[PDB]
Ligand binder design. Structure first.
Ligand code: 3GG
Lengths: 67, 68
């Protein structure tokens, strides 16, 4: 089958994930995709794509970086 | 050690020469007790390595993911 770009592993996102329920975030190197952010959740150990506009993500990433 | 028994921060060492093009993804650990929270999974060899948070391209990489 023909493919016209690399597939985006994230097609849908969750908007109601809390920072406290995240083991880690993964930021996928898929810059042409709208959704690059995955969370692995603490309560069940599953991965979900998450809303990149969640304000807590920004402070989470700033703290990781400004070290 | 199993993780359940580990008190050590996960990243012992970091790498400063990881090219953006060789990164499958960055994993940002939720470990505020620790200095190094950024792990890259590499495309060419599939290793996970901790990376220097001052690596040149990381900030722009992360900002682009957010700015959609
Ligand atoms: O392989 C790497 N590290 C490692 C850690 C423990 C044991 C053996 C090896 N690092 C690595 C970093 C960057 C690149 C690379 N190639 N092109 N762009 N980045 C390849 C390997």
């Amino acid at each position: 089958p023909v493919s016209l770009s690399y597939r985006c592993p994230c097609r849908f996102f969750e908007s109601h994930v809390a920072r406290a329920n995240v083991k880690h975030l993964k930021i996928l190197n898929t810059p042409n995709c709208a959704l690059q952010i995955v969370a692995r959740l603490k309560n069940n150990n599953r991965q979900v794509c998450i809303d990149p506009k969640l304000k807590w993500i920004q402070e989470y990433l700033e703290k990781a970086l400004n070290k």
